[PDB]
Amino acid sequence: SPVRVGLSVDASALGHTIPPDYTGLSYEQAQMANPNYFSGANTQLAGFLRTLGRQGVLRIGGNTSEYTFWNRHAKPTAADEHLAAGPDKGHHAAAREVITPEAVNNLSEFLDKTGWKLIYGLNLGKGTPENAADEAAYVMETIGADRLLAFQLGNEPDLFYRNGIRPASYDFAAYAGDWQRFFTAIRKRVPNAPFAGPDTAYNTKWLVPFADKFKHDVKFISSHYYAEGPPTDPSMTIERLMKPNPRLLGETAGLKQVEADTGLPFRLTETNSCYQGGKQGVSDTFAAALWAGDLMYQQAAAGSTGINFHGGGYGWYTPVAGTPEDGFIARPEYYGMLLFAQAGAGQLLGAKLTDNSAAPLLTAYALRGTDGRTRIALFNKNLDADVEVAISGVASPSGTVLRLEAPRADDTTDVTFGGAPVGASGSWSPLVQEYVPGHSGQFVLHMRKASGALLEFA
Template identity: 45%
Template sequence: MAAATRWSAAEQSNISQVSLTIGSVLPVSVPKEFVGLSYESAQLANPEFFSVKNKELVRLFRELAPNGNLRLGGGSSEYTTYSDEAVAGPMPFEVFGPDTSKTAKKGTVTSALALKNLRGFLDAVNWSCLYGLNLGQGTAEAAAHETAAVQRILGPRLLAFQIGNEPDSFRNRFRAASYGPADFIAEWERFHSAIVKVTPQARFAGPDISNKLPYLTAFAEIAPKYPDVVLLTSHYYAMGPASSPEATLDNLLSPYPKLTTLKRRDLHVIAEAQATAHLPYRMSEGNSCWDGGKAGVSDTFASALWCADYMLQCAARGWAGVNLHGGGNGYYTPIAGAPSTGFIRRPEYFGIKFAQRFVGTTVLGVTLTGASPLVDAFAFESSRGRELVLINKTSQDLACELGDGIAGSLVLTLTAPAIDAKEGVRLAAEHGGFDRVIKAQAYSASVFRLRKQ
């Protein structure tokens, strides 16, 4: 039997006491391509970016996940065009960035060369691709031409096409104020018909909406008519825009205002859409707050804890995956930088890598008693055995008593010098003894190996 954990009186005064029980195995497993990143389509205007020549970026993708999904889309996809020919003249930029369609609205051309380089990149990192098409300002004929090239060049690396980015935001931008779900579905079906005439083997995902759930419901209702629709998608930003005074570090750590209380219905609508369409669901774009993130919030260790927690919440719901949006030097991008200056891992990168540990596992039920709303627990079963995750987003250390004759041993921690630290994030293996009472330090994510006493 493991020895009882002992802390000094001073330590005990700053330790929150909780208890936990592990439930039964749930009918949920985490898919191998659960981890994903999302980049703007305009990034392909630089054909050297997603290329095997960009060796440092290849290394960072490989290090993040041995299998994953790269989604290309975003606001710039509604301004990007395709050309079979290489674009003459200098590239419009070395590295693009998040949400820059607000300032760069032309000159972003995807060429066949960019697609060939992208295929080499995807082969090198062993990731698939979710590819966005221009619905906002494009034509069905242009989409069909581009789709044929993408299908031919990306081949088995192509997961699916998405027709349009955030069509629920087209009103008063690309469409009339009266534009609604029925109008989108009519356009989607017209584009789909044109595409499959040229590329009958194409597969599709959607509706890739921002937040207006009637579009998701409408898409789910027509999806059974189309066997080539393989995935439901939409976006999620925890806060935002970045200019909002409510986009704060404390609110990022709070218990997901969009996933609880008034927004709890969102989860029900997603689940209902899955049941209607008989399809898996993927969060295809999202992050801490939109407009590229907020300095002092999106680029701090808080974003890593938020990211790890959010991704495991999604995994526990049985979602197909999560694509965190980024690129360039946006504050929320997991990987920042450019080929000429070098790349850096932002704190969120380590939160994603923490969640990657549980790809391929089966989810277990967990009941946490007496904990702050800022503490979350998850449990998983795999060839490593049973593992427990405690994510402690409070300023107090946490002592957790394991029930049912179970003991735990610390095997991995995600920590940093401070919750607002931009550097010094540490994802490290640990080697502790088994104990009936386990400890998770303040502002940390911890993994414990479990065994019966």
């Protein structure tokens, strides 16, 4: 008894072109203490990234970027060789960590193995302008201008007061002074250094004035987004995660207005479902695959240049979990990102849903792929409604579907895409071929409650 909905694809209703480096991941700066983590020797993790995209961006930053210190004079410690730095849980100060030349050297080899570009945090919370200049210089020397997309000067400077990185009086004016002192010092060592900022969630007292003041000094605006609101909200649940987020829609409009005003594009450089490394039973579940995959397309359709899902260690929300010693595994959220990866880049098209008020959390995105083939990504985020989608507007002799599936929305395992789990080192290929029945120039796709689908048309 599915809800019977219509989907009308309009090849003339042109949306944004998804860039090839749209996908991405965010990690804590602290992880750079361990030269074995972002290393050319870390073939497993490099494989996971390549499966997410042949192009993409690795962002390193986070709350630990205020507690992490480049030391050109240092070599990794024995403890550094086993450090697994998951998402910062925001409870108190992170441990002090040291980044060495060796770790930067190894990060360059990791970027060469993955083909991803880098956003690299510098320590404006507690470090000096001169050490940021020295760190930037070594990153530029070692990673190179082609792979280095941007430096960032502080992570979430609007929240520095929370753990005493700044006094409660710290405001945009104080941060602009800091930012300019760091920018000037860095540009003396690295005249071509690229920047992004302010590396926080959209707001009127920080991000808007940042863009106005520093629009000639940055390449793009870096924003953050978590589906979970402030801690006074009802605890985020799977049910809530599947629903529209009016805060997201408003902040995205805010970023679009900044782009119109300043010319600066925006990237979502730290995102995930829930704070503090995630919420067990929400962030580490199949629902996070549906949420993440749908978010990637929602933001692409809104004109975002890309995304970076925060993670690392064994954090509840991490796309990829594990360590070089123990191995790495794809978590449920990774499968949402994998659906996006398999769809590929291209230009979004109009895709209007009708007769869908009883299945209101179904989303759909149509894409003219760079290879000329039409694809449709659907997320049936309705937890209790199966759907039957009558697809009009596509003329093709053959459509196939790859399904994003788990037996329950709160599953922490049992997730597959195209009838297969992801294996070691990001290995994935589809194992189930399913055609979508076509008649009268239309197709009909069934989707179970709490599932996703990627359709490809010949």
